[PDB]
Paper text:
[name] is one of the principal polyproteins of [name]-1 and its constituent domains are (from N-terminus to C-terminus): matrix (MA), capsid (CA), spacer peptide 1 (SP1), nucleocapsid (NC), spacer peptide 2 (SP2), and p6. In the mature virion, the CA forms the genome protecting protein shell, which contains ~216 CA hexamers and 12 pentamers in a fullerene type arrangement. A highly conserved sequence in the CA protein, the major homology region (MHR), plays a critical role in assembly, maturation, and infectivity.
Purified CA(A92E)–SP1 protein assembles well into helical tubes under conditions identical to those used previously for CA(A92E), adopting a wide range of helical symmetries. The CA(A92E) mutant was used since less bundling of tubes is present, resulting in higher resolution cryo-EM data than for the wild-type (WT) CA, in addition to attenuating the CypA-binding loop dynamics. Among these, the tubes of the most abundant helical symmetry (−8, 14) were selected for three-dimensional (3D) reconstruction, using the iterative real-space helical reconstruction method (see Zhang et al. for information regarding helical symmetry). The cryo-EM structure of the CA(A92E)–SP1 tubular assembly was determined from 33 tubes at 8 Å resolution, with a gold standard fourier shell correlation (FSC) of 0.143. All α-helices in the resulting density map were well-resolved, which permitted accurate MDFF fitting of three neighboring CA hexamers and analysis of the interactions at the dimer and trimer interfaces. In both CA(A92E) and CA(A92E)–SP1 tubular assemblies, the atomic models of the CA–NTDs superimpose well (Cα RMSD = 1.2 Å), and the CA–CTD dimer interfaces are also similar in both structures (Cα RMSD = 1.6 Å). In contrast, the trimer interface in the CA(A92E)–SP1 assembly (between gold, magenta, and blue monomers) is less compact than in the CA(A92E) assembly (green) similar to the trimer interface observed in the CA–SP1–NC structure. In addition, the linker between the NTD and CTD is conformationally less variable in CA(A92E)–SP1 than in CA(A92E) (Cα RMSD = 0.8 and 2.1 Å for CA monomers in a CA(A92E)–SP1 hexamer and a CA(A92E) hexamer, respectively). This suggests that SP1 limits the conformational space available for positioning the CTD. For the SP1 peptide itself, no detectable electron density was present, indicating that SP1 is likely conformationally or dynamically disordered and does not form a stable, unique helical structure in the tubes.
Residue numbers in the entry:
A (entry chain R), B (entry chain S), C (entry chain Q), D (entry chain P), E (entry chain O), F (entry chain N): 1 to 221
The structure:
Amino acid sequence: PIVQNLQGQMVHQAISPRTLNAWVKVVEEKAFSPEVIPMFSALSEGATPQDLNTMLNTVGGHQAAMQMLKETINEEAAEWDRLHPVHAGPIAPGQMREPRGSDIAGTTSTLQEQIGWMTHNPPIPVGEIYKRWIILGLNKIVRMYSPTSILDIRQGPKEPFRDYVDRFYKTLRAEQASQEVKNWMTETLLVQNANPDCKTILKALGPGATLEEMMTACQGV
Amino acid sequence: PIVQNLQGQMVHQAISPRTLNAWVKVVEEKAFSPEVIPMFSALSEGATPQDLNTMLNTVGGHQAAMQMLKETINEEAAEWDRLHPVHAGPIAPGQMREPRGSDIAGTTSTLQEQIGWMTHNPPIPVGEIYKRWIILGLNKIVRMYSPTSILDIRQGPKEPFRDYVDRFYKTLRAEQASQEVKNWMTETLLVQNANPDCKTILKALGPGATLEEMMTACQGV
Amino acid sequence: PIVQNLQGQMVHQAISPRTLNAWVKVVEEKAFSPEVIPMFSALSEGATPQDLNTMLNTVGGHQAAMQMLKETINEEAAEWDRLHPVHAGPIAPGQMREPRGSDIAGTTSTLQEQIGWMTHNPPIPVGEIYKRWIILGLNKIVRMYSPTSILDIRQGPKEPFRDYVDRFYKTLRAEQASQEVKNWMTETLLVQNANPDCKTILKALGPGATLEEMMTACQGV
Amino acid sequence: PIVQNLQGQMVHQAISPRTLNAWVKVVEEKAFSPEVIPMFSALSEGATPQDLNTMLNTVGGHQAAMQMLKETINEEAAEWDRLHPVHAGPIAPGQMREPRGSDIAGTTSTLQEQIGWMTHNPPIPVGEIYKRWIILGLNKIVRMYSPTSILDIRQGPKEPFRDYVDRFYKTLRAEQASQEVKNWMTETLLVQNANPDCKTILKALGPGATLEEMMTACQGV
Amino acid sequence: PIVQNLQGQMVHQAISPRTLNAWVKVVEEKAFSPEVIPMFSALSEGATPQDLNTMLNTVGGHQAAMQMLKETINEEAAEWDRLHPVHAGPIAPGQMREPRGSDIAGTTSTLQEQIGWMTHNPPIPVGEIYKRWIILGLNKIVRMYSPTSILDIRQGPKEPFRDYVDRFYKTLRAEQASQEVKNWMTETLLVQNANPDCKTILKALGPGATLEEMMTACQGV
Amino acid sequence: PIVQNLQGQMVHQAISPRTLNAWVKVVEEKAFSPEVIPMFSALSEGATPQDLNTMLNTVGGHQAAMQMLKETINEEAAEWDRLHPVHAGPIAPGQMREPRGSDIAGTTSTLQEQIGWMTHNPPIPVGEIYKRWIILGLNKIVRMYSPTSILDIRQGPKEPFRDYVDRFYKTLRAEQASQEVKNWMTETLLVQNANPDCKTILKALGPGATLEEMMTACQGV
């Protein structure tokens, strides 16, 4: 990791044992559940591509998903190469060179160049660029490892609205979808896939009713 | 979070693994229980909107409450905009741009922006403004996910007074009701819904008796 | 709390995740057991009233004890308020005000006021004042939830004197009773409530024996 | 280990209890599963050769595997002495001695030579050379201690492709096979050792298919 | 406790949670066992009298000993007052008041006074003095609470010399005897009080043999 | 212990809780195992004799070993005094006193003296010296509490070769014998003490076969 102290004093730190353990245990316990993404992202704030590779490589099992993640990363490295030409210019001997895809993915750069890119002026955020590429592949993994389709999420006849809504927003959370489309699934599907009895109730509230009002309206139906 | 050092030197740091796990296990273990709000608020001291959002996004499950909270937050951000019109013409180069409700909520603002208002003299403490909106949305949730009103809490045949007075001020603690109404519930219901045996003993003290007189009188029944 | 660093800089620090966990486990493992009150005093070393209410409020359940505690704090506050003369008109900017009972209890004051009082020499130690009120209320509660009278503790037919002494000064520690009454209990009851055999041993030493002499005599019975 | 602090400041410190313990417990619990080698690299960031011997000598249990690794360490050591002969006379003015194989392996050399080599400019990275020699012998242990070869990974009749693919990308992970060769093993063996139903669907995709296209095709199978 | 930084700055810091918690755990796991007195002393590095009292009060149960310990501390406090009485007239303007036993016992002395004595020119280490007084009483607990004497350990017909010697030196640790008396007990009781089969062997090695030599001798009897 | 900071500022530090807990746990799990001995050095890197006395004295039980160790140290101590006699006539004015053997074992030397010798230039390493005596004595203990002869380690009629090479080198590790003789045990005894079926397997490879070759050859017999 690299920890910035007062005055922007940037110092690399080797990775902590209790980070290593927390992150590995999270993936053993909860698998590819959506909270893994914010947890991953948090626990790798200021990480180098080597520290990020550590976190993935210290995981055993789930090797079908990690093989997909490698490929996804290899695709984002071919796309960084496509977008940023490979030509070495009249750059100074002591100044940082220009990162490649494989520099970003942590394979052709050294730790000192990765610390260098991050700390240097101008900086290149090779650690966070790589995080976006991992997180994308994780979006593919979460989406792939979902057991449920969001359209089949429906209120039962004897199902409290509130337990259905937990089901609706779990299965929705685990979709990759535009926000606009997710807005549409809330405003169309929630009232639409309800039970007749509760369906009536949410309609009487009209279109400016809140989920709070909606849960409290269906408290005893 | 942002650690205030000596000479008033404020340096940001990312949120700890053991804060993340203590907050995560709290929600798993204790659900929407009243002490969860001071516990959340306490583990979130010195938090930015990004750190508060981290803590909420690392909560896996309970998504009907997180959606109810999203709508609540949006209502407090939008309400902030209601109070404050858009600031016309050019922004001054010595001055920070004044936050909109969506900058406070952490979404049309960067992390660096959040740190910018909060640290820049005279500080705008957007973390502690937004935090109060979160603690607002949580109270609504704590109060909703409560199964019992005070009328529904009574002492059974052989139940010790002590466990009942605990049940009573736990359910009162979690109610929506005002202090004049929560006084009325205390002075009426508490002795009224005691069992025959304990009710007889509390009647023999008089009505002017204290909770201390009430606890040491009715203990062995 | 407020951590004093070098050359007497007292600077506030948030209550640590492990402070919180420690108080949660202490209350979990040992409830309303005597030595828990020292754990609290220790965990509240250099604490503010916000940090005292945070610790009390972070307690799961036990609202009969906490409602009793509120009643005691509110009584201690009304008594402080009673004794201190009322301020004539507003407080001029150079006048650091003198706290009312509710200022001490953290309900009418700001954190900056609580810090202000403590650091502005001759210090008004509002944390340490409020802690005595809380500790005082914890002793009443503790004494009141204490199961067994000191009078009723007695030796088994061939029970070891040492184990009987452990029970006697364990129960004695939870007794309301005066130091002078407890000195009588030492001189009268300790031999008195022993069993026929050990009683005889103990009687033969006369009253000049210390507890080591009582212990070494009853080393074999 | 040796901690690089602000501005090339290298400072010696002891190997951490909870480091040491983390390594003993990974080996106690999990032996020589593929994830153990990345864990060992994760836990030894900035370790000297001495610190690296500390970690091998603190293993109890499994001394045939540890023996295999010493022999490997002597092989890797002898090869370093073959490639670079002894350097005659007394050491060059203000220059560090070129280490032997036994110096990299931490036996003929002293900890102060090891700290000089690592911290000097140009640095001699003795810690990372020996660490490769250890990682090579841990791979011989991993591979030997494995019961299944990648030729032997095959799908059940009613088995999910995904769980099988997890056994395959785990087994592929422990292969000493080169990357051009691992690529043949992916495009050939995965479908070939598939069940007849999932095999048919995957053959229909053509030879252009990704792992994702293969997993989403055999989702219903 | 009081933490010394560079330039001889001694600044008090509040008692650590995990120090507190570890102490508590020691008394529960090992009771008042011999090895506890060096662990306690170890855990009470830089302790004030108030931190020493905090450790004693943070224990519950085992109160016959806690009573022995109280009385012993009072005796020693009474001894310091006898050895060091009050000197004529009021206190110096710039210096501290000379300590009483009750000030060393931390009961009549404020924390500030206690900081005062350790930091003062000339300093009285009232912590380290009080701790020795505590340790005298702890040794009285160890010696009283040992179940058996060094005289009472002799070797059975199927007992291994090794286990016999384990028992001998265990029991010795807890006795009152001096090193020249303890020396006599090694050279006299151990072989004397051994079983016939090991005794012939040990006599044969002759009285200049070590315990390692005696232990190897008696290894297959 | 003594922590060497940047630019070589050596300041003594209090004996860390997880130093104390780590050594306690280590002894509880691994007793007289050979692995205790590197762990002992690693956990004592940077120690004083006071601190080494703390770890040894905080060991409960094992009092046969503590007497054997004690004896080994007094022997090493007696000898250090024989070889290093104190200088003729009057003392150098500024200098520190001569460490005697008991000083080095921390018996007769205070904390300050031990800190002087270690930090003084040229340093007298009382800590590292005491550790070799402690390690010498620990190696005797380990070896004593090991019982099996290496001649007695043989393969069962259908025992896995690995479980026998593990037993063989576990017992070999605790043998006293020179390295060339341990090389002789490797070449003679290993293949010799194997069962008819595995013996046959190894005999077919020819006698030049490496342990990697012996282990893959007997992978399944």
